Design a protein around this nucleic acid. Structure first.
Ligand SMILES: [Mg+2]
Ligand SMILES: [Mg+2]
Ligand SMILES: [Mg+2]
Ligand SMILES: [Mg+2]
Ligand SMILES: [Mg+2]
Ligand SMILES: [Mg+2]
Ligand SMILES: [Mg+2]
Ligand SMILES: [Mg+2]
Ligand SMILES: [Mg+2]
Ligand SMILES: [Mg+2]
Ligand SMILES: [Mg+2]
Ligand SMILES: [Mg+2]
Ligand SMILES: [Mg+2]
Ligand SMILES: [Mg+2]
Ligand SMILES: [Mg+2]
Ligand SMILES: [Mg+2]
Ligand SMILES: [Mg+2]
Ligand SMILES: [Mg+2]
Ligand SMILES: [Mg+2]
Ligand SMILES: [Mg+2]
Ligand SMILES: [Mg+2]
Ligand SMILES: [Mg+2]
Ligand SMILES: [Mg+2]
Ligand SMILES: [Mg+2]
Ligand SMILES: [Mg+2]
Ligand SMILES: [Mg+2]
Ligand SMILES: [Mg+2]
Ligand SMILES: [Mg+2]
Ligand SMILES: [Mg+2]
Ligand SMILES: [Mg+2]
Ligand SMILES: [Mg+2]
Ligand SMILES: [Mg+2]
Ligand SMILES: [Mg+2]
Ligand SMILES: [Mg+2]
Ligand SMILES: [Mg+2]
Ligand SMILES: [Mg+2]
Ligand SMILES: [Mg+2]
Ligand SMILES: [Mg+2]
Ligand SMILES: [Mg+2]
Ligand SMILES: [Mg+2]
Ligand SMILES: [Mg+2]
Ligand SMILES: [Mg+2]
Ligand SMILES: [Mg+2]
Ligand SMILES: [Mg+2]
Ligand SMILES: [Mg+2]
Ligand SMILES: [Mg+2]
Ligand SMILES: [Mg+2]
Ligand SMILES: [Mg+2]
Ligand SMILES: [Mg+2]
Ligand SMILES: [Mg+2]
Ligand SMILES: [Mg+2]
Ligand SMILES: [Mg+2]
Ligand SMILES: [Mg+2]
Ligand SMILES: [Mg+2]
Ligand SMILES: [Mg+2]
Ligand SMILES: [Mg+2]
Ligand SMILES: [Mg+2]
Ligand SMILES: [Mg+2]
Ligand SMILES: [Mg+2]
Ligand SMILES: [Mg+2]
Ligand SMILES: [Mg+2]
Ligand SMILES: [Mg+2]
Ligand SMILES: [Mg+2]
Ligand SMILES: [Mg+2]
Ligand SMILES: [Mg+2]
Ligand SMILES: [Mg+2]
Ligand SMILES: [Mg+2]
Ligand SMILES: [Mg+2]
Ligand SMILES: [Mg+2]
Ligand SMILES: [Mg+2]
Ligand SMILES: [Mg+2]
Ligand SMILES: [Mg+2]
Ligand SMILES: [Mg+2]
Ligand SMILES: [Mg+2]
Ligand SMILES: [Mg+2]
Ligand SMILES: [Mg+2]
Ligand SMILES: [Mg+2]
Ligand SMILES: [Mg+2]
Ligand SMILES: [Mg+2]
Ligand SMILES: [Mg+2]
Ligand SMILES: [Mg+2]
Ligand SMILES: [Mg+2]
Ligand SMILES: [Mg+2]
Ligand SMILES: [Mg+2]
Ligand SMILES: [Mg+2]
Ligand SMILES: [Mg+2]
Ligand SMILES: [Mg+2]
Ligand SMILES: [Mg+2]
Ligand SMILES: [Mg+2]
Ligand SMILES: [Mg+2]
Ligand SMILES: [Mg+2]
Ligand SMILES: [Mg+2]
Ligand SMILES: [Mg+2]
Ligand SMILES: [Mg+2]
Ligand SMILES: [Mg+2]
Ligand SMILES: [Mg+2]
Ligand SMILES: [Mg+2]
Ligand SMILES: [Mg+2]
Ligand SMILES: [Mg+2]
Ligand SMILES: [Mg+2]
Ligand SMILES: [Mg+2]
Ligand SMILES: [Mg+2]
Ligand SMILES: [Mg+2]
Ligand SMILES: [Mg+2]
Ligand SMILES: [Mg+2]
Ligand SMILES: [Mg+2]
Ligand SMILES: [Mg+2]
Ligand SMILES: [Mg+2]
Ligand SMILES: [Mg+2]
Ligand SMILES: [Mg+2]
Ligand SMILES: [Mg+2]
Ligand SMILES: [Mg+2]
Ligand SMILES: [Mg+2]
Ligand SMILES: [Mg+2]
Ligand SMILES: [Mg+2]
Ligand SMILES: [Mg+2]
Ligand SMILES: [Mg+2]
Ligand SMILES: [Mg+2]
Ligand SMILES: [Mg+2]
Ligand SMILES: [Mg+2]
Ligand SMILES: [Mg+2]
Ligand SMILES: [Mg+2]
Ligand SMILES: [Mg+2]
Ligand SMILES: [Mg+2]
Ligand SMILES: [Mg+2]
Ligand SMILES: [Mg+2]
Ligand SMILES: [Mg+2]
Ligand SMILES: [Mg+2]
Ligand SMILES: [Mg+2]
Ligand SMILES: [Mg+2]
Ligand SMILES: [Mg+2]
Ligand SMILES: [Mg+2]
Ligand SMILES: [Mg+2]
Ligand SMILES: [Mg+2]
Ligand SMILES: [Mg+2]
Ligand SMILES: [Mg+2]
Ligand SMILES: [Mg+2]
Ligand SMILES: [Mg+2]
Ligand SMILES: [Mg+2]
Ligand SMILES: [Mg+2]
Ligand SMILES: [Mg+2]
Ligand SMILES: [Mg+2]
Ligand SMILES: [Mg+2]
Ligand SMILES: [Mg+2]
Ligand SMILES: [Mg+2]
Ligand SMILES: [Mg+2]
Ligand SMILES: [Mg+2]
Ligand SMILES: [Mg+2]
Ligand SMILES: [Mg+2]
Ligand SMILES: [Mg+2]
Ligand SMILES: [Mg+2]
Ligand SMILES: [Mg+2]
Ligand SMILES: [Mg+2]
Ligand SMILES: [Mg+2]
Ligand SMILES: [Mg+2]
Ligand SMILES: [Mg+2]
Ligand SMILES: [Mg+2]
Ligand SMILES: [Mg+2]
Ligand SMILES: [Mg+2]
Ligand SMILES: [Mg+2]
Ligand SMILES: [Mg+2]
Ligand SMILES: [Mg+2]
Ligand SMILES: [Mg+2]
Ligand SMILES: [Mg+2]
Ligand SMILES: [Mg+2]
Ligand SMILES: [Mg+2]
Ligand SMILES: [Mg+2]
Ligand SMILES: [Mg+2]
Ligand SMILES: [Mg+2]
Ligand SMILES: [Mg+2]
Ligand SMILES: [Mg+2]
Ligand SMILES: [Mg+2]
Ligand SMILES: [Mg+2]
Ligand SMILES: [Mg+2]
Ligand SMILES: [Mg+2]
Ligand SMILES: [Mg+2]
Ligand SMILES: [Mg+2]
Ligand SMILES: [Mg+2]
Ligand SMILES: [Mg+2]
Ligand SMILES: [Mg+2]
Ligand SMILES: [Mg+2]
Ligand SMILES: [Mg+2]
Ligand SMILES: [Mg+2]
Ligand SMILES: [Mg+2]
Ligand SMILES: [Mg+2]
Ligand SMILES: [Mg+2]
Ligand SMILES: [Mg+2]
Ligand SMILES: [Mg+2]
Ligand SMILES: [Mg+2]
Ligand SMILES: [Mg+2]
Ligand SMILES: [Mg+2]
Ligand SMILES: [Mg+2]
Ligand SMILES: [Mg+2]
Ligand SMILES: [Mg+2]
Ligand SMILES: [Mg+2]
Ligand SMILES: [Mg+2]
Ligand SMILES: [Mg+2]
Ligand SMILES: [Mg+2]
Ligand SMILES: [Mg+2]
Ligand SMILES: [Mg+2]
Ligand SMILES: [Mg+2]
Ligand SMILES: [Mg+2]
Ligand SMILES: [Mg+2]
Ligand SMILES: [Mg+2]
Ligand SMILES: [Mg+2]
Ligand SMILES: [Mg+2]
Ligand SMILES: [Mg+2]
Ligand SMILES: [Mg+2]
Ligand SMILES: [Mg+2]
Ligand SMILES: [Mg+2]
Ligand SMILES: [Mg+2]
Ligand SMILES: [Mg+2]
Ligand SMILES: [Mg+2]
Ligand SMILES: [Mg+2]
Ligand SMILES: [Mg+2]
Ligand SMILES: [Mg+2]
Ligand SMILES: [Mg+2]
Ligand SMILES: [Mg+2]
Ligand SMILES: [Mg+2]
Ligand SMILES: [Mg+2]
Ligand SMILES: [Mg+2]
Ligand SMILES: [Mg+2]
Ligand SMILES: [Mg+2]
Ligand SMILES: [Mg+2]
Ligand SMILES: [Mg+2]
Ligand SMILES: [Mg+2]
Ligand SMILES: [Mg+2]
Ligand SMILES: [Mg+2]
Ligand SMILES: [Mg+2]
Ligand SMILES: [Mg+2]
Ligand SMILES: [Mg+2]
Ligand SMILES: [Mg+2]
Ligand SMILES: [Mg+2]
Ligand SMILES: [Mg+2]
Ligand SMILES: [Mg+2]
Ligand SMILES: [Mg+2]
Ligand SMILES: [Mg+2]
Ligand SMILES: [Mg+2]
Ligand SMILES: [Mg+2]
Ligand SMILES: [Mg+2]
Ligand SMILES: [Mg+2]
Ligand SMILES: [Mg+2]
Ligand SMILES: [Mg+2]
Ligand SMILES: [Mg+2]
Ligand SMILES: [Mg+2]
Ligand SMILES: [Mg+2]
Ligand SMILES: [Mg+2]
Ligand SMILES: [Mg+2]
Ligand SMILES: [Mg+2]
Ligand SMILES: [Mg+2]
Ligand SMILES: [Mg+2]
Ligand SMILES: [Mg+2]
Ligand SMILES: [Mg+2]
Ligand SMILES: [Mg+2]
Ligand SMILES: [Mg+2]
Ligand SMILES: [Mg+2]
Ligand SMILES: [Mg+2]
Ligand SMILES: [Mg+2]
Ligand SMILES: [Mg+2]
Ligand SMILES: [Mg+2]
Ligand SMILES: [Mg+2]
Ligand SMILES: [Mg+2]
Ligand SMILES: [Mg+2]
Ligand SMILES: [Mg+2]
Ligand SMILES: [Mg+2]
Ligand SMILES: [Mg+2]
Ligand SMILES: [Mg+2]
Ligand SMILES: [Mg+2]
Ligand SMILES: [Mg+2]
Ligand SMILES: [Mg+2]
Ligand SMILES: [Mg+2]
Ligand SMILES: [Mg+2]
Ligand SMILES: [Mg+2]
Ligand SMILES: [Mg+2]
Ligand SMILES: [Mg+2]
Ligand SMILES: [Mg+2]
Ligand SMILES: [Mg+2]
Ligand SMILES: [Mg+2]
Lengths: 64, 116, 149, 202
RNA sequence: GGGGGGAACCUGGGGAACUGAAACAUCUCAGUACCCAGAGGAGAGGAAAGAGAAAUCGACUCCCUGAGUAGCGGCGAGCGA
RNA sequence: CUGUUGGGAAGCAGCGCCAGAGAGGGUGAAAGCCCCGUAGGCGAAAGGUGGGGGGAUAGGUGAGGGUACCCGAGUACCCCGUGGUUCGUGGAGCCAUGGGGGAAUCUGGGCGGACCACCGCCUAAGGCUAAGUACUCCGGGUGACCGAUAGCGCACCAGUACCGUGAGGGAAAGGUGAAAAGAACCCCGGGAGGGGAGUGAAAUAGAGCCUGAAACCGUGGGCUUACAAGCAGUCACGGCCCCGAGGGGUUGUGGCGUGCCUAUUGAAGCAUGAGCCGGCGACUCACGGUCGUGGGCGAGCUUAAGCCGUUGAGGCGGAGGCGUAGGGAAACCGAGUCCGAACAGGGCGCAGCGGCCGCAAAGUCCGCGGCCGUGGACCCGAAACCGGGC
RNA sequence: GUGGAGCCUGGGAGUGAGGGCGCGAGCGAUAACGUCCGCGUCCGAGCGCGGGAACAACCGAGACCGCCAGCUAAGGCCCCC
RNA sequence: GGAUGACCCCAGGCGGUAGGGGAGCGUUCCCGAUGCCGAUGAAGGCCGACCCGCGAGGGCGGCUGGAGGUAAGGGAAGUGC
RNA sequence: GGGCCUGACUGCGAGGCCUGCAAGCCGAGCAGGGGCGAAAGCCGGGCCUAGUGAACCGGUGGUCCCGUGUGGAAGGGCCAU
């Protein structure tokens, strides 16, 4: 039967035009009071997942 | 479609069995034992065609040595003297000479003493 | 040219890999699976795209983001597809959404928006939207922007 | 582009047709492969350990019998048991690209054309449904039956007359297809036939 | 007039567990297996107190597609209009 | 039809003929023309069907104006407990309903995802309804389906023998020959069996019957062996025997030499497995994905279900899918966009060869191959768990 | 320095029980065919070959095939040899 | 070198378990085939010190067997113990 | 030790350290609005290396981005915690 889109990945991640995989930096969900502003700010960006980890996530998204 | 074993396996077994003609008991009679026997046989043959080259040369040497000592020297001396004289007749031949041609062997012995 | 002459080009029809058929093939006994363990078993491993041996997975440690939607689902709103000026080059006279669908440029169910990559051509282009630069290039090349609603 | 003999009451004229100059044997092979796969019945079947007639009882205990462990006698390791990965009902067909079939048709006719083996005819003399009638006409048309012929015409009366001849394959023009052209040595067509074929390769 | 039978198919009344979740309880398996009642050559459904945004369509059934979309989900495994 | 070889002609040879029939099966071997058929035609007094054609019957059919009589009740509706839906308590509507409460008759009511308004949609609480759909005990047709360990459990007197108190389990077992011409009669023997005779093209086709492998048992012959130390061979030489400057068989002496498989750091290993032989026996298929590859077309590529045709013929079908633009949670903007006060900085994006022609290419379709996902997913094996019965 | 070198993109793995030895340590008892690291090696996969009486990892040496030819390596040259 | 995988010449590599890759052999079935081989003997069996091939194998001969078999080139798998 | 102070900034961030991933670390410089200093300049906590916890679910403040025919509303997204 056809493959299913993994909804947890669909909800965390985006495949960019050239097929990199992009996600939010981890670590500002909470426990933030003593984090510097450099930290909070930088954790506010997206990052490009390491190739082996991205290639795996990509196969979970067969129809994006 | 179905492809049942058919004729194929009996034919491989006869091949092996036929190579095993001569072997003892099940070794010529049982495909399994024949095949074991053959693995061993092929490795020995390989090993032994290597050592036949050695087996003969050892023999030539025992013979040359006998023929040398009739003329008062040993194999090691005789071979060094040949070397120094520049004589390159090989041991297969030195041996045939020593038996079939004593006069020639004697002369080579002479050149060998003389060459040192 | 006769039936006995009909052949696939070299490489067009390759043989399959057959395992577990004897030593000479170099794929016998273990059938290229190595020795023992879960992956050698019939049924094999867990989904290697996700599973990581029991530790929290790479994917599941990344944060979710944005609106995921709620029952009763997607909210119906007009959707726009852009098609650039350069794609309009091939037409002469008029372009309308219907035409662009036919040519295979605009997908059905999307409203038309004209965009600015390329040069404008003095055509009457009818559409639901124009970018700033598309409007400019078109007005400048003497073409006629018509807005649908 | 090609020059094609046409038989007439007025005699052997010539007709100009643009058929591909290049024949692509791989593609011809691909069309024939598709044709022969899709006519397959796919009716080969076997039973699995689950589909076989025996019961699911474990035949003897797991341990302490001195015998090998088994479950039910349906398991494929038993004579009588199911078969592992045998054939099951199958559909061998697949949708070969339309343009390929088209290009394929055209190339096949083109290939016979380039050999002189394609012959167009206006009508069929006296053939009114009798084999000996077609046979006469054929002799006169240069078909002694030493070469196999794919006869394409909408004239039912002509197909009936020729069908029984071992060296003749008959077809309506809607049926023209590359396996039949490639199977036969000579191609013979009605103009009306030639007309539809030209519309199909358009 | 009923009663009883019929290989599958069908509707209705009841309805598991292994297993999967690399443990497990929600979840899955699955309204499946299976028991029961009933029908019939089919059964069910069917002529809008519908759909759901089109100023629209127009009973029901069944196939393709829409779509693994929308969503659902110890937002896990998965489930899925 | 004839000739010919042959037990037999349908083989080979000569000369013919049919074909809307050269599908296929038989006949002593290989047959268009010998038989059964095949193409094309024909056929029901009786019973069944009859969705097609015809006929009948039931039944159907108006417009203003007024009246406010009727328009499905323990129902709607609300609350509580649940189920159904993609919806697992969620912002949880809708449909259904076990408990409680409980209306109205169009100025009535239900619905459009809490709720409210507005704007629309629809008429609950009675019933029926062909067809298009599912299945295959049954009949027929057809296989890049099996061919007696296969294929149904059963080609055969099988759901049998047999096993089990019972539910229930559940086999093995096909083939003389063209024709029985199935061996009169004699001989040995109680018989069985054999030897002659006879039949047959053939009888080691003789019914314990086609072929008739291998393990296994024997008779006969060649070579060899009773002072010898062995994973059984191998290399060398010599003896003997055989077929005829060579080969084959055998093996006295000399040299060398730790079975196979499995599992292991490491096995000849005193670690697993195997008595031997034959046969069966384990990486597949569908659908999706990802790469590679052979082609087709290329800013485009491609059709699905179906419909027409065919009866091993293909065509139509553009609904839809992938691609042609990205960025952003989104509104939204767009070769940009997001963060930002920023025209700052940054993230993620954007930009063929030759001579208008050819050539290559995005991409996409089909084939092929590797690997992945979902399925039992390479085969065999539990102890267990659950349902219904005995 | 042109090598079964290196670097980049992608397809397919297997492995994730090692072991002996030399040198450097820890642990142990300046014990273990002990144990645990480091650098190297070999066996693993070279239970192919020569030497070491025999013997995976000590010495010699990396077996494409054939030869009744030659030179050497470690180790040997009284007989077994 | 010759132009192209025609074959000759010079040189170098060629131990191998897990495992990657390449090239082939054979089994059943389909197209090729209304053909071709076949009772002057099919398949299958038993021999062979012969021929070709590195090999898997393929030929050829004799005996058995008595009615089938199937090429060059391709296709598909219940394909090798 | 004292004076003035809140840079224990906001928007970013060249380039690196480390590293299987995910993390962790250092950071010149530009803009906004500041502190100290006459100025050069320094200040995006603390001489430094420990004082910590991914995701999911949820709370609170802000934003005013989505709001299931439409206007709101429910509920969510986003920034902060
Ligand atoms: Mg999730
Ligand atoms: Mg965070
Ligand atoms: Mg958290
Ligand atoms: Mg937060
Ligand atoms: Mg929060
Ligand atoms: Mg701090
Ligand atoms: Mg800070
Ligand atoms: Mg911020
Ligand atoms: Mg899609
Ligand atoms: Mg995309
Ligand atoms: Mg087999
Ligand atoms: Mg067989
Ligand atoms: Mg066999
Ligand atoms: Mg074999
Ligand atoms: Mg045989
Ligand atoms: Mg063989
Ligand atoms: Mg012997
Ligand atoms: Mg023997
Ligand atoms: Mg014996
Ligand atoms: Mg024997
Ligand atoms: Mg061998
Ligand atoms: Mg050798
Ligand atoms: Mg040796
Ligand atoms: Mg002396
Ligand atoms: Mg010397
Ligand atoms: Mg010398
Ligand atoms: Mg294939
Ligand atoms: Mg092999
Ligand atoms: Mg390989
Ligand atoms: Mg290997
Ligand atoms: Mg093995
Ligand atoms: Mg592998
Ligand atoms: Mg593998
Ligand atoms: Mg294994
Ligand atoms: Mg391993
Ligand atoms: Mg194993
Ligand atoms: Mg292991
Ligand atoms: Mg294991
Ligand atoms: Mg493994
Ligand atoms: Mg294994
Ligand atoms: Mg296993
Ligand atoms: Mg299993
Ligand atoms: Mg498993
Ligand atoms: Mg969404
Ligand atoms: Mg104009
Ligand atoms: Mg088929
Ligand atoms: Mg099939
Ligand atoms: Mg079966
Ligand atoms: Mg079957
Ligand atoms: Mg079973
Ligand atoms: Mg069963
Ligand atoms: Mg059963
Ligand atoms: Mg069963
Ligand atoms: Mg049964
Ligand atoms: Mg059972
Ligand atoms: Mg049972
Ligand atoms: Mg059971
Ligand atoms: Mg046991
Ligand atoms: Mg036992
Ligand atoms: Mg047993
Ligand atoms: Mg046993
Ligand atoms: Mg058992
Ligand atoms: Mg079993
Ligand atoms: Mg069992
Ligand atoms: Mg069974
Ligand atoms: Mg069976
Ligand atoms: Mg069976
Ligand atoms: Mg089986
Ligand atoms: Mg199986
Ligand atoms: Mg099985
Ligand atoms: Mg299968
Ligand atoms: Mg089917
Ligand atoms: Mg396939
Ligand atoms: Mg298909
Ligand atoms: Mg014909
Ligand atoms: Mg033909
Ligand atoms: Mg009843
Ligand atoms: Mg009844
Ligand atoms: Mg039910
Ligand atoms: Mg009831
Ligand atoms: Mg129920
Ligand atoms: Mg229960
Ligand atoms: Mg459970
Ligand atoms: Mg299960
Ligand atoms: Mg699973
Ligand atoms: Mg579990
Ligand atoms: Mg588990
Ligand atoms: Mg447990
Ligand atoms: Mg469970
Ligand atoms: Mg399951
Ligand atoms: Mg369920
Ligand atoms: Mg039920
Ligand atoms: Mg069932
Ligand atoms: Mg009943
Ligand atoms: Mg019906
Ligand atoms: Mg009905
Ligand atoms: Mg009904
Ligand atoms: Mg009504
Ligand atoms: Mg879509
Ligand atoms: Mg469900
Ligand atoms: Mg005669
Ligand atoms: Mg005759
Ligand atoms: Mg004749
Ligand atoms: Mg016919
Ligand atoms: Mg016939
Ligand atoms: Mg026939
Ligand atoms: Mg014939
Ligand atoms: Mg025949
Ligand atoms: Mg016949
Ligand atoms: Mg008829
Ligand atoms: Mg008839
Ligand atoms: Mg009125
Ligand atoms: Mg009233
Ligand atoms: Mg009403
Ligand atoms: Mg009532
Ligand atoms: Mg309720
Ligand atoms: Mg529910
Ligand atoms: Mg919720
Ligand atoms: Mg709800
Ligand atoms: Mg109620
Ligand atoms: Mg109202
Ligand atoms: Mg009201
Ligand atoms: Mg209601
Ligand atoms: Mg309501
Ligand atoms: Mg409402
Ligand atoms: Mg509504
Ligand atoms: Mg409505
Ligand atoms: Mg009803
Ligand atoms: Mg009707
Ligand atoms: Mg129906
Ligand atoms: Mg049917
Ligand atoms: Mg039937
Ligand atoms: Mg067969
Ligand atoms: Mg057959
Ligand atoms: Mg049998
Ligand atoms: Mg059977
Ligand atoms: Mg048999
Ligand atoms: Mg039967
Ligand atoms: Mg059976
Ligand atoms: Mg049977
Ligand atoms: Mg019986
Ligand atoms: Mg009992
Ligand atoms: Mg009984
Ligand atoms: Mg039982
Ligand atoms: Mg049995
Ligand atoms: Mg018979
Ligand atoms: Mg008979
Ligand atoms: Mg006969
Ligand atoms: Mg008597
Ligand atoms: Mg008698
Ligand atoms: Mg007698
Ligand atoms: Mg007698
Ligand atoms: Mg006679
Ligand atoms: Mg004869
Ligand atoms: Mg015989
Ligand atoms: Mg016989
Ligand atoms: Mg017998
Ligand atoms: Mg016979
Ligand atoms: Mg017999
Ligand atoms: Mg016999
Ligand atoms: Mg015998
Ligand atoms: Mg004897
Ligand atoms: Mg003695
Ligand atoms: Mg003696
Ligand atoms: Mg010896
Ligand atoms: Mg000697
Ligand atoms: Mg001899
Ligand atoms: Mg000898
Ligand atoms: Mg040794
Ligand atoms: Mg030994
Ligand atoms: Mg050893
Ligand atoms: Mg072996
Ligand atoms: Mg073993
Ligand atoms: Mg073990
Ligand atoms: Mg062990
Ligand atoms: Mg051990
Ligand atoms: Mg031993
Ligand atoms: Mg032993
Ligand atoms: Mg033991
Ligand atoms: Mg042992
Ligand atoms: Mg063990
Ligand atoms: Mg036993
Ligand atoms: Mg034996
Ligand atoms: Mg066997
Ligand atoms: Mg595979
Ligand atoms: Mg693929
Ligand atoms: Mg492809
Ligand atoms: Mg194409
Ligand atoms: Mg798609
Ligand atoms: Mg930018
Ligand atoms: Mg091109
Ligand atoms: Mg392409
Ligand atoms: Mg993969
Ligand atoms: Mg399954
Ligand atoms: Mg499987
Ligand atoms: Mg698999
Ligand atoms: Mg099992
Ligand atoms: Mg028990
Ligand atoms: Mg339990
Ligand atoms: Mg229990
Ligand atoms: Mg029970
Ligand atoms: Mg019970
Ligand atoms: Mg290079
Ligand atoms: Mg290398
Ligand atoms: Mg390397
Ligand atoms: Mg691979
Ligand atoms: Mg691995
Ligand atoms: Mg491993
Ligand atoms: Mg481990
Ligand atoms: Mg380890
Ligand atoms: Mg270990
Ligand atoms: Mg190591
Ligand atoms: Mg270690
Ligand atoms: Mg040692
Ligand atoms: Mg060490
Ligand atoms: Mg030292
Ligand atoms: Mg040390
Ligand atoms: Mg240390
Ligand atoms: Mg001491
Ligand atoms: Mg140690
Ligand atoms: Mg030590
Ligand atoms: Mg130590
Ligand atoms: Mg080491
Ligand atoms: Mg190992
Ligand atoms: Mg070594
Ligand atoms: Mg090494
Ligand atoms: Mg070795
Ligand atoms: Mg050694
Ligand atoms: Mg030694
Ligand atoms: Mg020694
Ligand atoms: Mg060694
Ligand atoms: Mg080497
Ligand atoms: Mg020397
Ligand atoms: Mg030395
Ligand atoms: Mg010594
Ligand atoms: Mg190698
Ligand atoms: Mg290669
Ligand atoms: Mg390969
Ligand atoms: Mg070949
Ligand atoms: Mg084979
Ligand atoms: Mg092959
Ligand atoms: Mg077949
Ligand atoms: Mg045929
Ligand atoms: Mg034939
Ligand atoms: Mg002939
Ligand atoms: Mg004859
Ligand atoms: Mg003969
Ligand atoms: Mg054959
Ligand atoms: Mg055959
Ligand atoms: Mg042979
Ligand atoms: Mg023969
Ligand atoms: Mg026949
Ligand atoms: Mg064939
Ligand atoms: Mg062939
Ligand atoms: Mg072909
Ligand atoms: Mg198999
Ligand atoms: Mg101040
Ligand atoms: Mg950086
Ligand atoms: Mg990093
Ligand atoms: Mg300042
Ligand atoms: Mg400043
Ligand atoms: Mg100042
Ligand atoms: Mg700074
Ligand atoms: Mg401090
Ligand atoms: Mg500190
Ligand atoms: Mg920290
Ligand atoms: Mg969770
Ligand atoms: Mg968790
Ligand atoms: Mg949240
Ligand atoms: Mg609203
Ligand atoms: Mg708003
Ligand atoms: Mg609403
Ligand atoms: Mg308002
Ligand atoms: Mg608004
Ligand atoms: Mg308000
Ligand atoms: Mg709000
Ligand atoms: Mg909010
Ligand atoms: Mg935030």
């Amino acid at each position: 039967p056809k493959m299913k889109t993994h909804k947890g990945a669909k909800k965390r991640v985006k495949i960019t035009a050239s097929g990199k995989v992009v996600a939010m930096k981890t670590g500002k969900r909470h426990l933030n009071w003593q984090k510097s502003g450099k930290e909070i700010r930088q954790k506010g960006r997206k990052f490009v997942l390491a190739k082996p980890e991205a290639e795996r996530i990509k196969l979970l998204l067969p129809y994006e | 479609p179905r492809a049942k074993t058919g004729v194929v396996r009996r034919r491989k077994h006869k091949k092996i069995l036929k190579l095993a003609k001569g072997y003892w008991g099940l070794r010529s009679k049982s495909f399994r034992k024949a095949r074991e026997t053959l693995f061993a046989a092929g490795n020995y043959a390989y090993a032994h065609r290597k050592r036949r080259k050695r087996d003969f040369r050892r023999l030539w040497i025992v013979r040359i040595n006998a023929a040398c000592r009739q003329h008062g020297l040993n194999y090691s001396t005789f071979i060094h003297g040949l070397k120094k004289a520049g004589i390159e007749v090989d041991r297969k031949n030195l041996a045939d000479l020593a038996v079939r041609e004593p006069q020639v062997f004697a002369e080579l012995v002479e050149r060998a003493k003389a060459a040192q | 040219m006769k039936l006995s002459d009909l052949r696939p080009n070299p490489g067009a029809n390759k043989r399959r890999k057959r395992v577990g058929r004897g030593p000479g093939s170099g794929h016998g006994k273990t059938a290229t699976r190595g020795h023992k363990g879960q992956k050698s078993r019939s049924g094999g491993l867990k989904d290697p795209r996700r599973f990581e041996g029991g530790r929290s997975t790479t994917l599941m440690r990344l944060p979710k983001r944005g609106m995921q939607g709620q029952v009763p689902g997607e909210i119906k709103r007009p959707r726009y597809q852009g098609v650039n000026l350069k794609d309009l080059a091939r037409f002469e006279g008029e372009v309308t959404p219907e035409l662009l669908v036919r040519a295979g440029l605009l997908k059905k169910g999307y409203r038309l928006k004209i965009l600015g990559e390329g040069e404008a051509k003095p055509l009457k282009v009818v559409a639901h939207a124009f970018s700033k630069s598309a409007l400019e290039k078109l007005k400048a090349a003497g073409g006629e922007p018509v807005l649908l609603e | 582009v090609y020059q094609i003999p046409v038989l007439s009451p007025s005699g052997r004229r010539e007709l100009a047709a643009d058929l591909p100059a290049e024949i692509n044997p791989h593609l011809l092979w691909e069309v024939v492969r598709w044709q022969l796969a899709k006519r397959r019945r796919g009716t080969a079947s076997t039973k699995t350990r689950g589909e076989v007639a025996y019961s699911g009882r474990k035949i003897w205990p797991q341990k302490h019998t001195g015998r090998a462990r088994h479950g039910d006698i349906g398991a494929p390791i038993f004579v009588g048991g199911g078969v592992v990965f045998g054939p099951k009902p199958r559909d061998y067909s697949y949708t070969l690209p339309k343009k390929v079939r088209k290009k394929g048709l055209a190339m096949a006719v083109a290939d016979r054309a380039r050999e002189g083996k394609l012959l167009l005819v206006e009508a069929f003399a006296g053939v009114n449904g009798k084999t000996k009638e077609f046979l006469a006409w054929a002799k006169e048309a240069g078909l002694d039956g030493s070469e196999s012929v794919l006869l394409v015409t909408g004239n039912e009366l002509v197909r009936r007359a020729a069908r029984n001849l071992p060296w003749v394959v008959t077809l309506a023009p809607e049926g023209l297809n590359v396996y039949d052209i490639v199977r036969t040595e000579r191609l013979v067509m009605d103009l009306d036939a030639w007309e539809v074929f030209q519309n199909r390769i358009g």
